[PDB]
């Protein structure tokens, strides 16, 4: 193929007229021609098959030579997505004279300048396409080991822990990494594949998932209502060299910060995202990478999504429980809003293997559509499509700066954009409903004795394949069926399901094996049944949700669920500290207080060696404060005047921390 | 209780090696990191010591970096 | 006492507003510095552009739009190959000249992980373990 | 700012601010120091002054702490605590300040002005921290005395290089030599900018100053030069590292059969390999410097730093190394300024080489193997602290002779210093004896060494040479000039220029007169290579012309005369002034 | 009560100036003394472990008998250890056996500082001074 041929529309239409000839619905290759948010899934899914026969060097941004006050730049005026086809900008500033701050930000963020002004890289370490190498030498990054808190370790072996054969042991450490970590982790994007998800089934699972997302509200908000949670964080590749995100959130006024957002509703901004290695305690030696997304993408994704991302994180008692605090009797409210009157409950939990790397591009587009269905009024259609293209060029298929070199990320959600946990929640609900649809269809049909359910399957098939437009009566009936027999609880991929046992045994609801099959043909991985649990009882709670086990205690007069952490992770967080100044102990009492708060429910655990961890932290806080007043009585000559550490070593404070009052 | 003492001492030892600026010699740092990771993920006592020895001989191998004569004198 | 309280609140307000004015002056002074640094980076990256072959392929394009993934592939003067072990080095750039992206490259430098230059004669199968691995080999277009 | 007491090494945060060097002090020690001397100003983390703006009372005996500030009795708050109380002065770590009874020595060190010999002998018999503190405050006093020199305003510009100056009356004029630098100032009613750094030399004729400037600005009448002072930095390392004998040689690898001439020094090489540090004392010209060269040869696997107090001493060490040691591992580090002529035959300024030669003040902060300090008598405890702070090593050798002339000590004027108090190492030499000792002159012929064995050296020399009949004496007086208090004897220079022909073998002789101004004068009239006696002591010459200028206390000291004469390899002509000194040696009469 | 409230405010401010100063001084002391506290902690733990191989390699490393590469664990793998003194040779070398890290190694090649191979016969107490002594023994694990 000609190396410069990017407009592949004619070949795509020839393929579609040779293979899928009698496919009833139309197919417009460039998805910018599409009608609504359900002809974008269709055409996008068709393209994600038709784009595995075209050369992989003719995707990504489309650069073009412009002139700024007589000097020639090369800037990106479009994109050629594998799924979304060709997308041209509408504001191409040919022959500009002066660059304001918005245009400067746009032309600094996008990798057209960076890839064009770099050396061609040929990296045999990976299999992902390697676009360029910015510097003259590839930078290798290591991860130094954690620092030891020896005082706490001697105090821990003083109280009798860490013996031979103990049921509490050090397992969570600070693993180190060699030079080749950062690029032998990015290599895991080889687990991604271009997967053509089913297209008459996605256009019904979208309806059911959207019904799951019907309570919340949102829309485009102005610049002056965006609430930044934290501001002293890095700002991607081309911007971290000069300051944190505070600099770009302070240098831009509200006028040219709304101008940017209204610029990415009619253009496309390709965006480099750096990949750094996280430095934190973990239970296994594989290096963990976090993708820092450049401020040019966060500063608009926050503005576009913040109203919905605050309405989800402020509604209590729903399926997406993000923002329900596990303290203050919040875990018991979660675990009672799961048991939403199902018949013979059994708790089920799954775990997607390689969730944030092997997620197919089509389901990321699905998540970014269902998360952008709320904008039915604030913005027009083409504005929504260019927001979708900007999300799929700044999150899904972007340029990853991985140790001094721009590679192309084939797909899978980056773990660092604005809508990460919520997009993963939508994807997770999509897989749950898809497993349910497969389990309900794939039953023998003549064995389904419950005559209402058999009629539901006979209508489900018709609404799936023999019906082109929505059927809101049936979608409502099926979503009521799911919330009656498959009550769910989601935290971005950590799920608990309260499925009726008789229906699963008959097959009218998704058991584990249906999830193994759905993850096989839609997620392209294999969720081996040794890492998805099933609890046949309810007086013991879910086995592991949010990496905090659940146990049933007697508080006051009544029984409540309490979440307790893995009682080795607390000791691992005590003995090892990622910064050497945290070794000193006496500075950090406001750290062992937090650890004791997190580890208090171990007091009521029937095992004793678990139960001793909380008393270890209490006695250690008391000894830390004793030696602190010793040093502040030697160093100065007078004790502290208003000393208020007499409650941190009493269990009444931590027990009040798990009570339903506040 | 000697098993969970080798795991921590390896963390201190790798901290010492890192502070001696051994990150430059990438061939040496790969072996030190591999020994550290296999020490921590070791459920058997003898194997932990047999890898701790290999890790420690990296520290002893640097003639003009540490002062073993002074450090051990406090025994 | 009314006068003193009013005066104290006046001084509090004035030193709050002068604090705000210091903050805004610092912000507008940092913005200009970032703008100057960004313009410097853009004009230096412009200066590095190989304006002959790049201009040739752009003027050879359909509408002047060439996909970014082929901008280096046809115009980059320098090629940094990164090789993880000797088995690949035998099959990708054996000799002093190799062919990649349908153009002939000549080796100019070979460095190791810790950036110590290794002559091409030391990369032998028996001498493979002694080398510090992956070898950044920098070559030039010919 | 917390730290350790300079009297008892307790944690504290007080600093007796009346001291020029501002040392830390524990609470009890600070009270005992401010109760006795006139030191009545204590600096805590903030200074102890009456924080009331309308007051100036600083003495810590009467200051009261109130609220979060300090006040006098007049501005005392209703609730106040007296600072100076119950044997202590209020400060941090008040409960853990262990007192000390050594406050008398600290009072005498920090109070005395370094003029009499009592202060110096107090500065060498005290503890280690007191040794360091005394040396540091002595250096600070020298710097402040240097600061009190006059200002040189020019009158007219004679030439592009020659200048006519006038010093401000009321402050003594500093002497003109290569060490003293000046900063120029151009006053045009504004813009008092440093116009350059200038070094001055007295002219050949007339009241003229030849200036060499870093800058090339043309001088005008209004420009004036002010002497620059160096801020003496504090030191931390001990004067002497603690000795630790070793059972066997460590950090060294001996080489069998190094040479034949080094045969008698093998046992001393092994002894230096044994001990942590060692001292070698010997009479002049007995191979002490060449012993260090053979020591370098005997352990070729040792990165050796030769360092010395002087400049031409380390240059002569470089020359001896080039004579014996293989050249391409030796370097000679010169400073960035390097206003004096160095020795340019090794790879200059190469710290990474194996055999590194340096002055004490120019040493780079480095690790090393066995380090040889040369001419310890020329160096004070500041120098030993510097060499022990910058060079961390596994073996230390200190070579030098107590009988030679010591460091100048310009502050000292009344009384004379005994040899054993020169510094810590000379005290070690004269207390327990040198670790290695070798006396037999391999330098000078028989008559000169016989005379020096009749001199200060009580007769012990057994030199292996015979009377070469190349030693000559004179007696005539000569005329004194007293240029900048550095006398010049023009008729003596004239007689030396007269001689100069009747024995042509002395046309390569080297001129010796301490008297730096006369040393510069000798470079013009007869043009012989010349060297002052202090920058001597480590080099030697085949023929030496020594000229005693004035019968003063300076150029009649027996140590200075001995170290001037004993550089004569084959011959020396000395023209003497004192009748007794001339008669005390046995050369030819002339 | 106005007076006592003002004094109480001043006392609380004094406490906030006590704590911040304390945990700044301790923080800077801990972070400025990390290169040596870590090593002293390491050797305290190494005494605490009380093993055999660790004590053997440390006690040999005090006497200059360091190894020149990582001690291997696989059978028939190579190790080059320097022996710097004949007293450090008499304790570890017995025949062709070499006791190190509480394991037996077979001596292959003993080379002095001049790199010329010297056989085990030449290592005699009388003949000990006649060698450039810092020997490198290349041995294999047995
Ligand atoms: C008010 C308080 C205690 C009052 C008291 O009860 N004194 C009685 C004495 C008690 N005994 C045991 C010594 C007798 C005194 C005692 C120690 C004083 C601090 C440090 O010095 C210096 C530090 C830096 C600055 O300078 C200002 C702030 C600091 C924190 C000081 C504040 C205040 O000034 C302190 C807390
Ligand atoms: N064993 C010897 N054989 C030959 N010459 C020697 C021997 N010992 C000393 N010398 C000579 O004596 C001189 C002494 O020099 P040096 O050590 O600089 O004296 P000083 O230490 O008094 O400055 C050397 O120049 C050397 O040539
Ligand atoms: Mg000498
Ligand atoms: Zn909108
Ligand atoms: Zn004082
Ligand atoms: Zn004291
Ligand atoms: Zn006052």
Numbering used by the authors:
A (entry chain A): 268 to 929
B (entry chain C): 1 to 75
C (entry chain B), E (entry chain D): 50 to 191
D (entry chain E): 1 to 590
What text appears in the publication on this structure?
The SARS-CoV-2 genome is replicated and transcribed by its RNA-dependent RNA polymerase holoenzyme [holo-RdRp, subunit composition nsp7/nsp82/nsp12 (3, 4)] in a replication–transcription complex (RTC), which is the target for antivirals such as remdesivir (Rdv). The nsp13 helicase translocates on single-stranded nucleic acid in the 5′→3′ direction. Translocation of each enzyme opposes each other, and if the helicase prevails it is expected to push the RdRp backward on the t-RNA. This reversible backward sliding, termed backtracking, is a well-studied feature of the cellular DNA-dependent RNA polymerases (DdRps). Our results establish that the SARS-CoV-2 RTC backtracks, that backtracking is facilitated by the nsp13 helicase, and that the resulting single-stranded 3′ segment of the p-RNA extrudes out the RdRp NTP entry tunnel in a manner analogous to the evolutionarily unrelated cellular DdRps.
Therefore, to determine the structural organization of the SARS-CoV-2 BTC, we assembled nsp13(ADP-AlF3) and holo-RdRp with the BTC5 scaffold (hereafter called BTC5) and analyzed the samples by single-particle cryo-EM. The sample comprised two major classes: nsp131-BTC5 (3.4-Å nominal resolution) and nsp132-BTC5 (3.6 Å). In the nsp131-BTC5 and nsp132-BTC5 cryo-EM maps, the single-stranded 5′ segment of the t-RNA was engaged with nsp13.1. This region of the cryo-EM density was well-resolved, allowing identification of the t-RNA segment engaged within the helicase as +14 to +8 (numbering defined in Fig. 1A), 5′CCCAUGU3′. We used molecular dynamics simulations to explore the fate of a mismatched nucleotide incorporated at the p-RNA 3′ end. The resulting pretranslocated p-RNA had a matched −1U and a mismatched +1C (−1U + 1C). In three 5-μs simulations we observed the 3′-mismatched +1C alternating between two positions, either remaining in the vicinity of the active site (rmsd <3.5 Å) or fraying away from the p-RNA:t-RNA hybrid toward or into the NTP entry tunnel (rmsd >3.5 Å).
